[PDB]
Symmetry: D3
Subunit: 291 residues, 6 copies
């Protein structure tokens, strides 16, 4: 019945993740552990945030997201555990996921547990929350935690207790909003009639280029499907294509497609060929779009 969806910076080249899973099954025998991914750049909370923010609408209600990169491991820091508000629609269009008209998710139906280091910034921003607690109770964490392995001690373990029905409000004291650490998200800037952002990610394993320019930013400027766009990357690359729903709309294999990715963001690719890999395009390069 209960699900823990687990996202960490632990990698998959040793037994580290398996140690966390052993403890999850120990504490909540009937649990199903779903790997989110374990491949994020260590300590890059903005990147980790990207792998967890879009999750809730896909999962059954009552799912617990155990999400961690813990560079402050072994310090007096304690994890935060939050019940989110809106499961939140998503995608290029903003919809429920699933067959038919999709699976509508109730509010207050998902818990995230993470270091209190900004990792949940965009989860809180995009979903809101109903309650948040500091994770301190020796009922849900070790009395003597391993200094270097707080993702296990302070996330995996308590997540399993939560999955098992340990009451959220009993993990430790309520946290005020200002006590929840946030990172600052770079805003999309208007520059004349151009929108100015960045490449937010290279979409592996395809080598598509994702930007932080959202559907809603495009709406502000009236850019809908069909608009001929100039999208300039790294300052010197004035790509030109219409905004289309998908890759194949570019026609011939190799042709430039400018589209909305499954996360709702303006993106650029080649049709059934890699854009980013041959030219070594990178996250953090500038991205400007104009009609």
């Amino acid at each position: 019945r209960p699900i823990i969806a687990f996202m960490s910076d632990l990698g998959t080249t040793d037994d580290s993740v398996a140690q966390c899973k052993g403890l999850m099954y120990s504490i909540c025998p009937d649990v199903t552990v779903v790997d989110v991914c374990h491949s994020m750049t260590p300590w890059d909370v903005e990147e980790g945030a990207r792998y967890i923010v879009d999750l809730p609408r896909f999962f059954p209600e009552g799912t617990v997201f155990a999400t961690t990169t813990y560079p402050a491991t072994g310090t007096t820091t304690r994890s935060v555990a939050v019940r989110i508000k809106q499961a939140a629609k998503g995608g290029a269009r903003g919809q429920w996921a699933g067959s038919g008209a999709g699976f509508e998710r109730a509010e207050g139906s998902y818990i995230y547990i993470a270091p209190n280091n900004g990792l949940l910034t965009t989860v809180l921003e995009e979903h809101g929350y109903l309650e948040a607690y500091e994770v301190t109770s020796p009922k849900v964490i070790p009395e003597q935690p391993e200094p270097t392995f707080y993702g296990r001690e302070m996330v995996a373990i308590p997540s399993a207790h939560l999955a098992a029905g340990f009451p959220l409000s009993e993990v430790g004291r309520p946290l005020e909003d200002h006590e929840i650490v946030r990172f600052n998200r770079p805003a999309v800037e208007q520059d004349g009639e151009a929108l100015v952002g960045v490449v937010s990610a290279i979409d592996h394993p395809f080598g598509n280029v994702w930007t932080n320019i959202h559907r809603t930013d495009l709406e502000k400027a009236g850019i809908g499907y069909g608009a001929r766009l100039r999208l300039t990357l790294d300052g010197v690359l004035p790509f030109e294509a219409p905004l289309t729903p998908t890759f194949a709309d570019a026609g011939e294999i190799g042709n430039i497609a400018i589209y909305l990715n499954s996360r709702g963001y303006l993106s650029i690719a080649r049709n059934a060929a890699s854009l980013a890999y041959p030219y070594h395009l990178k996250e953090g390069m500038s991205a400007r779009v104009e009609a």
Copy 2:
């Protein structure tokens, strides 16, 4: 009880596969999702085929194979769902898998669902099929599918409905045989008394070299275990060894072994050393064998 075995080109560097799994558990609460792999070269249907064709005899009857690389995502194309006929023996010798005499599998016991883009070419060729349907019903796919994520929309989602016991014949109309896209498989050619093929794969993580020269191709030349072979790769690097059951039969560590791999194909390796990696041997290089 139900199992979905999931093979995609999504990778494991973000939450993409986790989103599919979330929907799979949502639709079919009792399901077990088994990762086949998510590492294939995007949009290489021939390679994808290799990862799925050998699967049925290993899995419990009733298993659904959700298999996808979807470069035509967001177009009017629709997936194909097929009930295969013969589970099919396999391996170096052609046998059932498992302990004792192996686990014999009843016919008609497995469903594959895939883009209709040739991905199932070798599944159909080696297993046959009993029935095939176009996947169109809004009961099993989204009414408004995400343009760029058809592996989720048109494979993961309906696969979970099938695992959940949604009648196969209700997914959409029956497809005639000519409506199922196939790729052309390069044939092994006889060239005097040499068999001429190709390196089909580098067997990672070992760096063994796999060819498309099947056991049946060797029997047809009368080549059995013990035959001294000259196996020439890339037209220029030749090798000489007896055909042996396994690596250790080569003797000293590092010695050349020519063998039949666990999928029934002529292969070449060094004994407990890598052959491919030091010499940068690659898929697609010619492979010629002669007694």
Copy 3:
């Protein structure tokens, strides 16, 4: 209820692991298969040992560890199956895992099954064993095993029978202690007042450097937290820092931390930066430590 924790050298780039899993579910329908890792350097039994030795205390009692690199596959060799004695405490300090005071594990609670090639060397050394058997019974292995895939035939399959409650003592004859293959572990030497060992692993994905110098080796040399250490790597590159519990104790980002890792061994890192990657530090480099 039953759990198989699976560690192999099979990788995750083809369907090899999924084939084993299919058979595991076939044999033991209610089993949960947990991936330990599949990324070990092929045939490196010392490295594989490291990924399995610390597992038992994390898992529910009754867990079966299926652990394999099988370079002698297809030969007359047979696997060994052992019931270990002590679950064994671990970590920087030596404790039970889990919330509160941790979860104590009963003796005799875990089975390992592996090639008899030394892979279990440190498992047996650190946990002891109560019983050990050669795996030969056609009830738990194939009568005609695939020559190249003994990890599946002789580890995965029988592990699933064991998980299903097949009596351990029925897998084949008892093995005497001398019949269980061991590798020799390089000892830490005292050299004057310095301890001399090796880099045992680069801790991915962080680039931390792990040595084979154990807490107890430090204890014997009169070294505890707070001791200023000089640690020399590769007989060239020197570092100096106090022994501290964790990374952040080093102060500024990028500063050297010398610490005890979660496995109980002397290690060195940069605080929230990679030590090993910029300097290309490697497994097998010498490591010398002095107060």
Copy 4:
């Protein structure tokens, strides 16, 4: 007084070039040997052509160009020695080289000696010739030439005899025009109003991109300095800039400059930054230019 300007595919990692030089000084004691370069891709006659075609106007009259890549070494092939007609103006503008108004060179003032394999194709095309001879006389080549080192035997040695005043007409028989091997040069095509060519070279060590679109091809298309151009590379990567004389005209460091190189061809660069290296741009990529 006498000069040999030496261009080979011999490299500079062994004594090969020094062996040729030793013989040059032996034969013509007062000679000055000038290295052109020795780094060309072996056997690439088109690339070797580029390193020699622009030389004559820079050198004193009477200079001998010894130019060689000799993949047909050790065969019945013999070198060609030609006296060119026009020294030929060059550069972005088409002028004589040197201080003041430049140094005009008399017609018939330079000899090239090379394998008869097409290496001199553009030399003959851009300079014309007055006379051409097969190099066969044992007075200027070895009676027993080294099979693998014809660049030394059939170019370096005879070039030194020529520099020493050995009569050109005495090296062997006159060659007719059809007996002089030519490669085919890919033409620049007009495609609507766009010029379509290729990247002819990456200009090391800067990473500037050179095309085969000549000043005169631009002239015919109505394009002069100041014209805003769109230049597309590899059919994917677009750049836009005015045609300017030099790099600094682009303004800020890193800005795109589109210009005429010192050989007279349309080129593109970043101002005091590398264009080609970060994007891995390559020789042979398509290059399309439009006003």
Copy 5:
């Protein structure tokens, strides 16, 4: 008789340097052109400066140094031509070069010609100068210079006229000191009793590490040969060795040597092994030394 020593950023993979040499021989037939090197990082004036500052004492009086990296090519900028004052002693000890007691060089005996872009900063600092002129006369430069090739037009050509005895004072107007562009050289800082500098260069092809901490800096602190030093690179590498004259003084092959290089600067190496290459040490890393 006359010598031009030529240092540029032109590389040795095309005919660019040979074009400059052709013109040098054209203008000054009896000249000897000596390659300094052509491998510097383009536009890195600090690096170019390093390859030219130590030259004068090695060369016959009357030598002309033609030294160029010209990113401002094709602009209104003009080269500077300077007669230096002190030829200047050098080396670990500060001496004349040559056999016996060395070759004492007269003052005012060397000319450098370069872009006026800071390239001569350390030449002027270490040698002083007696006169400096802007290079503008059409007698020594082209009336219509190639826009992209000012190293040839504005350095190679005029250098050859100077070698031929064209009067220095006739190249153009005298320049005031403030009109000669300088870069700022990073000072060695005292930090307690440590000297703090940088790695100024990796010494290829050996991989020795050179710092900007000079013999004279070492004298200020009393550090002479025999002093046990701690030299910390990149902030975290506290190397320890005595200051010794040479590599072999470190004893065993591979041992750390801290020494004075042939340019007079504090350096660190391994004895007959590479220090920098295995650990990827780099120019610009911090370098701290203390007794």
Copy 6:
């Protein structure tokens, strides 16, 4: 008239070689300095030897070879200066170099000067010598030599004095034969009727493979041009071809050629393609040949 041929481990990435040249022109104004190469692996005397042993027959009588890799720089070691006996024929066939019947060189006509560290081992072995002296006289070396630059101090400088006619016997005391350091050359072994040696070099820039199996080794096995050979590299990659004079005799581009290189040694290549580079073949790999 005088020539110095200069082979060092100094590289061409800084002004090091230029400093030596400056001193050479200072000491011997009329000299011509010919670069042999400066690219050898530092401190690899065996490799250095390869670049110098074949030189004499190519150069005018009276030529001085200044040859250095000086890992013992700054120690009490002193260079050796030798007058060699036989200039020595060479090549695939063993002949004089040059046009016509070649240039016969008188005995005693060449001097080498080198560190006394084995660098001249093969020079002495293949040419013999008439006289050898330790280089100690302050007339030909510095009274206070630079500790780290002995190739300049103890080779370049005295070589220029010798070129200038300083009497060889006046450089210091005569050395007895046992005082001249030699390295041990690995012998070609006979192994049944196979000849067993080593890959001595990858022939750059082509990627041909050179062995230490000499023509004389082949004659001793009766192997002449036309013999079908099996040549096995690295113990595992074998090749089959007739021994032919040159590359083109292999026929089609890419075909394997086995030949005698221009230095008289058994070699293997592809015809106008690289053999070594795609397969990463390396110096030091075993090389076995059999008829």
